[PDB]
Design a protein around this ligand. Structure first.
Ligand SMILES: CC(=O)CCCCn1c(=O)c2c(ncn2C)n(C)c1=O
Ligand SMILES: [Mg+2]
Ligand SMILES: [Zn+2]
Length: 334
């Protein structure tokens, strides 16, 4: 291919150039990006980010190969799924891109660790069917049997993300050294596996413990002396970016909330048809969208982002406020 300016073919190039000025900002509107990029946000944003960080040249990644992988990856997100489609992936990627550039983490991560995090973010939900792990377990699916009921979807996301590199002209890591490929794989595994919600408690516990014994340079920049600490920060970062929806401008968060409930209810419908015990928040006949988000933010999202903010202080101060404003907004919408 000839490679379009912003990676994708668009009829609204300038309206798109407008939004991409927010590429490095929390305030980026990915819904607009999707609209202006013919529904290919993940391909667009990943291309932009990779140019922005000079990652194509750094790792000697042919552009045509990069674009072919990204389109392939995007195609394996399900368009009929309400929330867990390529838009969610583009969102999580871009948030991750911002969280990497946060001042308190300046010159901490290697280029490889950066590359891994962005690759993990992009693939973390590929080929999601629109139902939870427990649904795949209860139905005795092939997937749940392969992976022994443990992080089924997440394991599936890793398998699919990596196997796609083998489709014609998709090997974006072809010029990486063996050592680097080995190392990237590990990091990506750890990060994607950390997006299983049942890992959240331990993840946050470790992050909290990290925060209490943190050491800083003269500048305010965090000092992560060794590898083990860094991947712990990377795991939490992608996890944060994954649950970053309620930290965004209210206009966006509400649209995310609508997408997730549609997905949730659609599972519930299917659970009902099959006479299965309905999963939490999936019963359209008894679910309070507004209560659920307040519980979610109170028990999961605030504790998570608070701890992250302590770690990167004071870089996340505005993000934390926005979460608290959004919490309040949903509290009063009951
Ligand atoms: C709007 C948004 O952030 C959806 C992505 C998170 C999905 N999600 C949950 O995972 C969840 C939840 N409550 C408990 N849990 C474990 N809610 C409300 C939720 O949306
Ligand atoms: Mg996931
Ligand atoms: Zn996700």
């Amino acid at each position: 291919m000839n490679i379009p300016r912003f990676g994708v073919k668009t009829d609204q190039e300038e309206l798109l150039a407008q939004e991409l000025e927010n590429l490095n900002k929390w305030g980026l509107n990915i819904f607009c990006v999707s609209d202006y990029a013919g529904g290919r946000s993940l391909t667009c944003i990943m291309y932009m980010i990779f140019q922005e960080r000079d990652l194509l040249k750094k790792f000697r990644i042919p552009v045509d190969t990069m674009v072919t992988y990204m389109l392939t990856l995007e195609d394996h997100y399900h368009a009929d799924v309400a929330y867990h489609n390529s838009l969610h992936a583009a969102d999580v990627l871009q948030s991750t891109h911002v969280l990497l550039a946060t001042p308190a983490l300046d010159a901490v991560f290697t280029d490889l660790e950066i590359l891994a995090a962005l690759f993990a973010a992009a693939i973390h939900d590929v080929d999601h069917p629109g139902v939870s792990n427990q649904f795949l377990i209860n139905t005795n699916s092939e997937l749940a049997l392969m992976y022994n009921d443990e992080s089924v979807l997440e394991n599936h996301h890793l398998a699919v993300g990596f196997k796609l590199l083998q489709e014609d002209n998709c090997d974006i890591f072809q010029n990486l050294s063996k050592r680097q490929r080995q190392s990237l794989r590990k990091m990506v595994i750890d990060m994607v596996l950390a997006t299983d919600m049942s890992k959240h408690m331990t993840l946050l516990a470790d992050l909290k413990t990290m925060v209490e014994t943190k050491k800083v340079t003269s500048s305010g920049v965090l000092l992560l002396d060794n590898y083990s600490d860094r991947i712990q920060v990377l795991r939490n970062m992608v996890h944060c970016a994954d649950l970053s929806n309620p930290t965004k401008p209210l206009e966006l968060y509400r649209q995310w909330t609508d997408r997730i409930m549609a997905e949730f209810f659609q599972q519930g419908d299917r659970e009902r048809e099959r006479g299965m015990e309905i999963s939490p928040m999936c019963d359209k006949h008894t679910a309070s969208v507004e209560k659920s988000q307040v519980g979610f933010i109170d028990y999961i999202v605030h504790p998570l982002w608070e701890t992250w903010a302590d770690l990167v202080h004071p870089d996340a101060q505005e993000i934390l406020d926005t979460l608290e404003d959004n919490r309040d907004w949903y509290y009063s919408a009951i």
